[PDB]
Amino acid sequence: SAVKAARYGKDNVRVYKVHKDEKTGVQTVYEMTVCVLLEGEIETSYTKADNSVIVATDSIKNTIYITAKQNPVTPPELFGSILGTHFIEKYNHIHAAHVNIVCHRWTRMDIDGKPHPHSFIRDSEEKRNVQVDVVEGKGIDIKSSLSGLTVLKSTNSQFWGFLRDEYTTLKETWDRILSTDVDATWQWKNFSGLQEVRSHVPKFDATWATAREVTLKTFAEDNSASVQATMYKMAEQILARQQLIETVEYSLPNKHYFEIDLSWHKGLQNTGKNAEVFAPQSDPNGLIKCTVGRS
Amino acid sequence: SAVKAARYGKDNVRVYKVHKDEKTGVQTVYEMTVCVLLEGEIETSYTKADNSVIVATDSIKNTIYITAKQNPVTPPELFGSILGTHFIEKYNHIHAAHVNIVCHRWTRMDIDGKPHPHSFIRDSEEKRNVQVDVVEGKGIDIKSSLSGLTVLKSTNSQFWGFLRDEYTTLKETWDRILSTDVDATWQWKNFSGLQEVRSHVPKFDATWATAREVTLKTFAEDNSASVQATMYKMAEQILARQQLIETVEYSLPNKHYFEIDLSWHKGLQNTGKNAEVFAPQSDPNGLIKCTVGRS
Amino acid sequence: SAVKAARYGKDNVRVYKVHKDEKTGVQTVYEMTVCVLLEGEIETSYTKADNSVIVATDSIKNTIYITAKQNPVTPPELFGSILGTHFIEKYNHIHAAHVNIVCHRWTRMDIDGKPHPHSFIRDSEEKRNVQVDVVEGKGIDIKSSLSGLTVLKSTNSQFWGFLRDEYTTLKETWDRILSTDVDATWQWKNFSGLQEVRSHVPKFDATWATAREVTLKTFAEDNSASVQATMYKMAEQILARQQLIETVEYSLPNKHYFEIDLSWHKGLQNTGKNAEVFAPQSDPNGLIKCTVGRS
Amino acid sequence: SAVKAARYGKDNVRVYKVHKDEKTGVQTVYEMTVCVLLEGEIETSYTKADNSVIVATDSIKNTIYITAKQNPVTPPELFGSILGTHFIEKYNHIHAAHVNIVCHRWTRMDIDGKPHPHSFIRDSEEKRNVQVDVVEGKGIDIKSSLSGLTVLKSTNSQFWGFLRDEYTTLKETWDRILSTDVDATWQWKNFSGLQEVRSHVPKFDATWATAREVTLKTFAEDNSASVQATMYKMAEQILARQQLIETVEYSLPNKHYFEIDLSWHKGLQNTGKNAEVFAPQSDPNGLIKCTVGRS
């Protein structure tokens, strides 16, 4: 037998950082969960019990805190790139670092219509994520994403004209509820190294904001023919607004809300035009994916 | 042996309702999870296999949907009171209904700075809940609550002057992070029946809003001496603003964020005044509770 | 306003302890999650910011580890009683301790049909729990429980003869699936203090084992007329086998598995006698509770 | 823009099937959660709102139940292969099916030392999974796995001789706790189609059993030099025992249990040789992966 692939590191490293503006007194907080996995010339730790090649996962944890102390942690694309580059430059035998960061929302509180200097609220479990792969000799690959954005529209969704055969019971519809949890990823063109990532720093937050805005607007305004057709519209727009993106991927559950026939009870009318009370279904759910790139 | 207490019913009943304003085209959605448990003269179902006394839990489920179809579902205090009263009036041998409702957030989307007629976002997993106990001959008891409100302040929290003995290692501090998930419950004075609950309908949303506002403002503005002292301030204010409330209960975890000493690494300064990077602790956590009533 | 009730302490304290038999080399592990909440003369911490009355929750955490170091951690009824008694005896102004312990399964591995001296498997998320309330002057109240015991029988469950009215759609049945997660609690007669708890030590594990055995046997062998009737049979037997128990409480979800009509597809027969494939329902679920005591 | 990749289908389809032996009266239950995603000539559903190419996800759900009604559901490798082949043969324009199945444990109860004909217990949340990719013209690729197997050994684990530099604080150790949740996957050689999968049917359960046995024995018996070295030993053995496997992949968290220094309290000795009480750490955790194939 032979080691065909190997990677190891530290997962679920929770990190908080505060920035204090001495002039204004305003404080800003960042909280993330970080995972770093390394690859390189480490096969002998598996095959020969040679621990000399192992940078201990505990040390990886220390390095994350030290790096957060000495560098900005925002945008996460930059922090992840710094963190990954560290490992491949510091250790001769480590040739790739894989850094995943999940950013948690701490949104500044408004009290009496003014932003509070040091108090924050978690408004939703929506996340902003990055995956950064730093590979010696092959630059920096960054996939940015948002996830956990849960939305619902109560009308202006349709689904008709699908294939019908002996396995089909679903009725065509011209008015249904559509609800999903959005997972959207945009993949950046490969960067040559940290200097290049640094040069594009302002684009990271801007492109996240654009992705979020396009998602919300398109969902709200499209008279949707299907989840497939609506998601494609979103992806198309994001690619149009940022030329440094190569592909956009969406993965969307179709979280079903079923009509409830109540006609058995006193002829009560609760279907079609008369539908008011629905039963949200926890499972199963549709799952629709697409990756859109440039012609 | 003897049956000392018994209750049975249906849990985890997910319900969605939409309201459509025909004049304006605006739609408003409500989504809840409902639990209804009944008590009464039902001992024989346990002791003698006498199912004749059982209103089937499946029927309870049907009744929830039917009741939602024929009545407003907001405020939840009113809906719960209608639902519970139904069971004790319909069935001679059922003498108490216990209704728990969890309300899920569907917040109307703003697109291009205007509120959208039919699109919604789940902004946070914060819930508004009610517990309604309808007891034949003893009126309607309602406990209203908010839960899952997660907040953090980065300074203006202290903790010093606590008891110190041979079990104590905690250092006194004049500046720490304070973060919690707020669970706040206000218990209404007993209501004589549905007519009385109906008479106070506007107070339900108003008091929820007040509880939320007082919680957020006090947390943000109190230079906190402890979780105990800050929570008492919140409870005191709520009782002052609504005379129909008898008690207010808060249950607050103290979600710890620990300093990380980095001095072992190149004398790096990250404690006390120099603390910037912290380690959020998943467990253990402090848990502090209090119930405040009137003198 | 006035403090009507208050309690505070440390939740989610994870503890592991190992015992090493030097003679045989056999090691035995225990893992628990502990919560300790105190009550007493502590109102001034809430009302006047008087921290002098506060035994810090961090100190409570230390005390749990120290107590585990110096005492047996099994049975949990004994450990909880020691832990709670500590607080009320050590601190003059603390008058009640509330100790909750969840015990996690670490079951010794059998390798090649022999028990391994130091390797363990988590066989299921079933828990053994205790709630111990130690109140100055009022002795020690102990509620023991098992939870998370998930079972299913594929036949020998019935449900017919329930009330039928205009809210009823459920068909009577003489053969259905029954599946539940068992939560069973037995409440001990009040103990005067630690000496008395110590005197009954062997009864704790024995009664847990009996409760578990009676639950499993009755579930498997009863041709069940309802969840109500079957659970009563369980409770009756436990009370008969241990005279130091005052009440037994069961709380049982009815986790529904629905028939799937497939007759629309090529007349395929999958209902009643021909039912083979079913759809497990995640929600809603029935919830049935009962507390049984002595005549 | 252009569609670069697309797949869609139904996730979280819960399925139960019962088998009844009429001769013996013995019943056997199977419960699974199934996900089916299709690929093929479906781009126009995204780009042109052409639903004619869509086999509705609701129909996919129906097909899963129908297929379960007419075929054995065990071993899951066979069921997944039947299910996937169905889609690529039935629909001209569908060219790949991706089937994921998670199998839930229902273990027959022993009552009074005899196996019960129709009662079952969920002994642990360990799963047996399959991923089956059926691609028109390219046969059937099957990855089988076990997951959620949680184990702990209290001694006979070491970790010393790792790299030490200015980022390192971890002390070398010759005796520590090792605990993990095992995720192990074995990838079968490509199969030409259903006939070939059918021919190897007995190997599927046998190889699952072997993987499980080798995992447990090696974990229990290896005086482990590291997680890396122990996992390699497991993978090597599995490959040796089944020639139709091409690679074995393990992904193992290192779930840390920390010593607790109690010397501050009355000189209490709880570290090194004297360590008895430990603090299980929920996060962070090491994460170690490896893929082993043939020379």
Ligand SMILES: O=c1[nH]c(=O)c2nn[nH]c2[nH]1
């Ligand atoms: O088994 C281990 N492998 C590792 O890579 C490691 N790093 N810290 N502790 C460790 N333990």
Ligand SMILES: O=c1[nH]c(=O)c2nn[nH]c2[nH]1
């Ligand atoms: O065992 C049962 N008890 C009940 O109360 C019930 N209601 N519907 N189905 C039921 N099954």
Ligand SMILES: O=c1[nH]c(=O)c2nn[nH]c2[nH]1
């Ligand atoms: O606000 C706090 N209250 C307490 O009771 C406590 N105990 N430790 N830290 C604490 N912080």
Ligand SMILES: O=c1[nH]c(=O)c2nn[nH]c2[nH]1
């Ligand atoms: O938007 C949808 N896309 C689909 O593929 C589908 N299948 N059933 N319902 C559906 N809705």
Ligand code: NA
């Ligand atoms: Na390198």
Ligand code: NA
């Ligand atoms: Na009544």
Ligand code: NA
């Ligand atoms: Na006392």
Ligand code: NA
């Ligand atoms: Na095909």
